[PDB]
Design a protein around this ligand. Structure first.
Ligand SMILES: O=C(O)CCCCCCc1ccccc1
Lengths: 171, 171
């Protein structure tokens, strides 16, 4: 109910996620991948990271009135990937130009003057490979940083310099 | 063989592991996977689990004189996979008949009265799919309990029950 899934992802129900009401779909295979940071509190355990994903979703749903947490996936410093909207549902991370053509993944915390531990970066790339494997991402997939497509500081000076070293990253 | 490397694994250096002195290799592709528990302390965090891996390698090397932590991989309740001897190197987990033909996976903890969390189970299972995709395991590969191939309680009643439900399990 219903998992044989992939790159070890914590499912919605596991992090006590309110149900999603979002219906719009993404046409896979998908082209772009946007990396952002939540700009929120960071966590480094599964217990604290479950709570943080829960907290981010709540702010998005109760306060901004969105159908679900905005990101397709969330990455905690505990080294785990948190299921947001998933591979199929259009996200709300990068504005209306990019939300229907990209998969937004978000690192939990502020990474302006901080860096995510390797395990988080590992989970992230693994997450991405796991995407292609399923057909959601297209192998040619390109990684853009949040600030490359929107006036924002996200994902942070420090995380942004790292993702530039990634092999699939295009400016 | 196949460029696309698989899954997330915490590398030896990251959990501060003593250099291995172990040299006997396994013949790819391995047919059997044997699941054990450590019957030791459990840890739920990246930090506390790295320590535990260290404690276990320590005890195997310093007190029992093995060339390396005996298991090929360890699984923590933090939902992470810790690297041991790896895919290509014979371990010291299940006796001499079995060590040369199987892969040893141990869950860090005593799973007699406790089941490991879903995230632990997810990593263990994902790890195996990675083995198959990498070519280190046989697509048909068979999972066995430690107690099926040795007189032992490992991997613990609770955990034993669970692995019996895996589709690759054969007693
Ligand atoms: O783990 C890997 O990277 C190799 C491929 C594993 C993909 C998950 C297997 C699966 C996918 C969809 C439905 C059931 C199982």
């Amino acid at each position: 109910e219903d998992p044989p899934a992939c790159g070890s992802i914590v499912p919605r129900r596991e992090w006590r996620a309110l149900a999603s009401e979002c219906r719009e779909r993404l046409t896979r295979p998908v082209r772009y991948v946007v990396v952002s940071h939540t700009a929120g509190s960071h966590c480094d355990t599964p217990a604290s990271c479950a709570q943080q994903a829960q907290n981010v979703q709540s702010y998005h749903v109760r306060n901004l009135g969105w159908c679900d947490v905005g990101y397709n996936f969330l990455i905690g410093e505990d080294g785990l990937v948190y299921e947001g909207r998933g591979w199929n549902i259009k996200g709300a991370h990068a504005g209306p130009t990019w939300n229907p053509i990209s998969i937004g993944i978000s690192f939990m915390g502020n990474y302006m003057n901080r860096v995510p531990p390797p395990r988080a970066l590992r989970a992230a790339q693994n997450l991405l490979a796991c995407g292609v494997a399923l057909g959601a991402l297209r192998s040619n997939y390109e990684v853009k940083g949040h600030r490359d497509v929107q006036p924002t500081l996200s994902p942070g000076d420090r995380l942004y310099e790292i993702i530039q070293t990634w092999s699939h990253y295009r400016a």
